[PDB]
Design a protein around this ligand. Structure first.
Ligand SMILES: C/C=C/C(=O)SCCNC(=O)CCNC(=O)[C@@H](O)C(C)(C)COP(=O)(O)OP(=O)(O)OC[C@H]1O[C@@H](n2cnc3c(N)ncnc32)[C@H](O)[C@@H]1OP(=O)(O)O
Ligand SMILES: C/C=C/C(=O)SCCNC(=O)CCNC(=O)[C@@H](O)C(C)(C)COP(=O)(O)OP(=O)(O)OC[C@H]1O[C@@H](n2cnc3c(N)ncnc32)[C@H](O)[C@@H]1OP(=O)(O)O
Ligand SMILES: [Mg+2]
Ligand SMILES: [Mg+2]
Ligand SMILES: [Mg+2]
Ligand SMILES: [Mg+2]
Lengths: 260, 260, 260, 260, 260, 260
């Protein structure tokens, strides 16, 4: 319902896309515990909604998210960290079944960068900037900064970025495979919506098998990933939407999915 | 035998390349059971031919393969699929020990795209297009689409492709690493045959060991992939061609290999 | 000490960067046992040196290294290789805690390419050329040319390089993610040192944990990698530098790391 | 809260053990939503209670848990199962960071057995029986039943148990290492508490890491397990309870752990 | 067909079990290429036969199989082996979707023991002996004898068996978990048939999934193995036999499975 | 050299076994640095000695190794363990190419138990006891005692031993697969030497390959485990000893292996 760190609203034609704007520009959308709490509540209600098929995540023109809130972390001990399982809440984004598109304008550093990488797709603004400056303040990134980055971008660029704290541009991010489309700043959010919209017009149950199938590519060997894929593939033949979509092509007419 | 769906021919210098062309242009080379049946026969003849050192696979100038034959899948049940090991036959291509180069002009969609990714090397034409549009017909890619794509191009672009069914250009695929060379439509097939000629000049057995070692990059941690590679490496030192290859270099002369 | 195959000097402000220059130019820095033996000695004293934070490894302007010494390999048998654990001494470079940057001008072929790929970051000169031509001498890459290359560059290009022995430009290399920056031949080594310089001013302990985390991306599933990253992340909180880094940030001043 | 399917109470001298007893004897502690929901609340509490060092899970004397509530699963569709993750909340045992010990008297069938296997340590009564009989009612085990059983017991016996639904005694389970102790029915829960009470004596933080390290053995290669273990083994030196544990030993006395 | 090396017959009440008896006693069922071709033939027709729900593989009373045929392997070079993919044809048994039970009487040495380990369940006779004696003829086991054995029995005993060639008894093997039952010599095969009979009572499709799930235990981390298990579990809710099976339990009657 | 903590000498038929006896009985063979240093020198020597084919490691009748040495460890900080790569030198055992057998009489606790488990084979005297009591002094095992133990013995017993520090008997260890023989105390060492003699009379090169194939069971999936095994299986066909073994068999005579 009511939110003070973010702005969540349904968007697209037929409102089939849920947009989540991080709205804490004063500290460039720095990711405190209360901010994350609210994104999780927001994600939950969009996951729960039957009309919603794809979620789009963004911040402002200047920043997607500058990073973790450093003023909270400052006095933590080792024991405090391990016992509490600090940054457990931050992983929620990777357990949503419906797909999430990151629309990243301006700065995505540290947590913000890590948040974008947890998403399934990233669209970048022209003046978007990606970095993992943790090393500069005596830590390493602790939310897949080392894992998801390196897998996208390759060892040499990940090592360079993680060990120096250096930033890369949206153009390089695209070239390296971290992001998959570059858009003007003014139309970025809209272009992500139109993509989210396309995905939303496909069957929710099958779309979720697809997403799950693509995430197995980082969790197992190709041989077993192939096998797992074949079983999700076979599974689709137990859905109505799969008979609908395939007989639509053969009849040369428009398909209509009931997410079933 | 005598094919109805494909053209299999020896090409290159001294006919050391096996060219398989998918020749079902009325259906945009849609990969029906009968066509894969023949493709697999051609693959087996060239595997057994001591003359042949590498294989190039193509379709027409308009289409490589537009997909699986959606008219055949229309009335499959979940039981039909599981107990038929449906699409298993499509994997014979992954068991070929000689290198296979895919020369993709025009459309390589869905099944067609997957066939391309199973090959060791992909060359694309200027107007080539890749897509996994199974999501539009209410399935997911069921022949490595999600696995090989994601491993080649990174999450963002694979998620966008599989979830929306969108197409990427020849040039989008080169930048992503899905393909390794772009050619003029008119010379693609010849450029691929030249690449196959080179490979064929090398020792078949050490070439087989190299391909096996490269494929292992997706089946193992790096530590064990490194251990596997050494076993193959040391193994080469039991071949006549290794001795000849290194003696050629020391005597400043051309190597003349004997597949042994 | 007094090496004959290499030069080793401390560089950067306050001699915080170790530079190793392969100096066997008459043989294009071909990696004979003697040379690798000196390389490892030099890595050891830099690794043991508390002033040094980073290591830059380079060759000549014409050649980084043109491969493993083929004359030493020529008369080896299978039994010689296996029992002598041939090439095992090369791996010492993968075991150094501190970051190593390759600065590649000219040829990096076969073992030379493999040596570069074992470093964390690769910087390339505008005329650098990468290749794995082992197949042309009747062997396969035996020091991770099929493992690390594939993981960087993708299957297609890797297969094409490994099976044909063909070379790729510095520009190709960067595009494929094998290298993270290209520079002019003239200033490569100085720009590599500058990168090393930044890294070396960060906490040596947390930097080492950072690197150990990024390398984990090739040794485990993303799930376990994430868990490993967290364990290391929490571990930083037991260090003096991690407090000194964050407190320096908050107070808006220079952090003063004591590598502890 | 005042539970209706279970009993949850603190036990041992100084009440340092959590005991959860499944109390649905009429249905032979068959697992239904209502029972699982409460078990999960009881785990949550004991995990939060700083006096609780270990948990014991048990049933009655005739039955630990005799399978699941099949009357609930009876009308379910495939879609219903997948969309609404079925048996998701049956998994919180695998997320408790303190050690849980199954104390199995009588039948542990279907989910019963799975529930026991999800625990760290299984103690079995003399007349205890284990089976995965889901095959007989047209399913397969869906709570790690094929996965944890096989890794405990081995392929032959796991395959025999799963494909026939046949039952093994406590004596067979012990031989095969599914359970690690056999006790008289009368004193089973009593032995389980004594074992739990020793575990409760140790440092809560250091016990937690030891647990995570053992669990690692089923999720990584031996190579990386060893690395992970080492890193946790280094972590212990950040804690007071290790400084305290070792200095108590060298001073020849009993140690006072503060779970820190 | 007209098998010269084996005997294949349907067995059990209702002929729902297929028996394959290796019948080359003059060579102690040594596994020459001819014998394996026929074994593979028999497996295929029992795999295709809809009445057959489980297979039993045996040899004679003196010998299950004494190993790979050492007279055939004698004159093979390294080149021959690698290029001929030697022993690759043995793996077809691992591709059968129906369960296979090895009934081992007397000698199961080297390849004999490897073949039995490829089966899903092993029943051993009181006088059976297991060994991997390849080392005493200057090879290692090359059909899973280092891999399955180790996984069943543990490092210490595997290392002992493979490095010395020493044999173990049925009792040793049961203790180690290589075999799940010991039978008298004279009723072993019938006892095995009775295990097959029970397996054949259940739904062939759900049994195929069950078997496929248990095999996954050796190919994945426990985390991925559970998600694969969950997906197969859900898949069963798409079959006739699971509703029938569950509705038959609730109604306290005998289920009638349709393998569907 | 002139050892002060160990006794090293050649034993067995023709002095082909290398015996390392830990000889610090009054400290129950606690694994201090001086002793591990010497151990490693002794491994290096027997590994280089072409007379030696296998190694037996032991302590005295009352103790194999009571563990590590808390005095050394008492003041270690977190930073000092990580920076100094603590217990790195304790791993050299896992890098010997020749087989190592442990002959464990009496106490093998903590570091002593890990040291045993690092060996290929464990033989235990009738009064042997195994334990991992690190938890009682506030650490976890740091030398694979959470990893090798769990793989050998199963989760329940592993969790029990590590979380309580409780001993198990020699008889319990064999039941669980941690050790492969139990011997009378007085003849233990001689039985281990007999087992070593057998190994030493086989081909060293093929023995080493076999040990490698077995060690791989814990480093990859069974699919890739099998492929690695095949590559080693073929490589033996490059050796003289394989031809000699198979020919010996064919000519009804004793093989005479030459280590080649
Ligand atoms: C020529 C051959 C055959 C002999 O092999 P070498 O390895 O001993 O000598 P190089 O091929 O490396 O040649 C030395 C030098 O002469 C050159 N050379 C050799 N033969 C010719 C010819 N025929 N024409 C022009 N240049 C030649 C060769 O390219 C070289 O110039 P660079 O490229 O600047 O190093
Ligand atoms: C190889 C290529 C690629 C580079 O060609 P170049 O024509 O620029 O240089 P050369 O191949 O002719 O060789 C240069 C020099 O280094 C030597 N070299 C180059 N690569 C190796 C390797 N890999 N091993 C040993 N020696 C090597 C080569 O033999 C030459 O020495 P000589 O014995 O005096 O002719
Ligand atoms: Mg090389
Ligand atoms: Mg790339
Ligand atoms: Mg066991
Ligand atoms: Mg054999």
């Amino acid at each position: 319902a009511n939110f003070e760190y973010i702005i969540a609203e349904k968007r697209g034609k037929n409102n089939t896309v849920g947009l989540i704007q991080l709205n804490r520009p004063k500290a460039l959308n720095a990711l405190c515990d209360g901010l994350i709490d609210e994104l999780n509540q927001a994600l939950k209600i969009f996951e729960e909604d039957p009309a919603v098929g794809a979620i789009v995540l963004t911040g402002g023109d200047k920043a997607f998210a500058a990073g973790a809130d450093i003023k909270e972390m400052q006095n933590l001990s080792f024991q405090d960290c391990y016992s509490s399982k600090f940054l457990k809440h931050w992983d929620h984004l990777t357990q949503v079944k419906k797909p999430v598109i990151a629309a990243v304008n301006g700065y995505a550093f540290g947590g913000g960068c890590e948040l974008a990488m947890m998403c399934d797709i990233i669209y970048a603004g022209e003046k978007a900037q990606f970095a993992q400056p943790e090393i500069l303040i005596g830590t390493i990134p602790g939310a897949g900064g080392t894992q998801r980055l390196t897998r996208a971008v390759g060892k040499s660029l990940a090592m360079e970025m993680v060990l120096t704290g250096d930033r890369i541009s949206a153009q390089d991010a695209k070239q390296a495979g971290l992001v998959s489309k570059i858009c003007p700043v003014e139309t970025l959010v809209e272009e992500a919506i139109q993509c989210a919209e396309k995905i939303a017009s496909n069957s929710k149950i099958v779309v979720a098998m697809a997403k799950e199938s693509v995430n197995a590519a980082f969790e197992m060997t190709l041989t077993e990933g192939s096998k797992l894929e074949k079983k999700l593939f076979y599974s689709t033949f137990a859905t109505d939407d799969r008979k609908e979509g395939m007989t639509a092509f053969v009849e040369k007419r428009k398909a209509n999915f009931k997410d079933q």
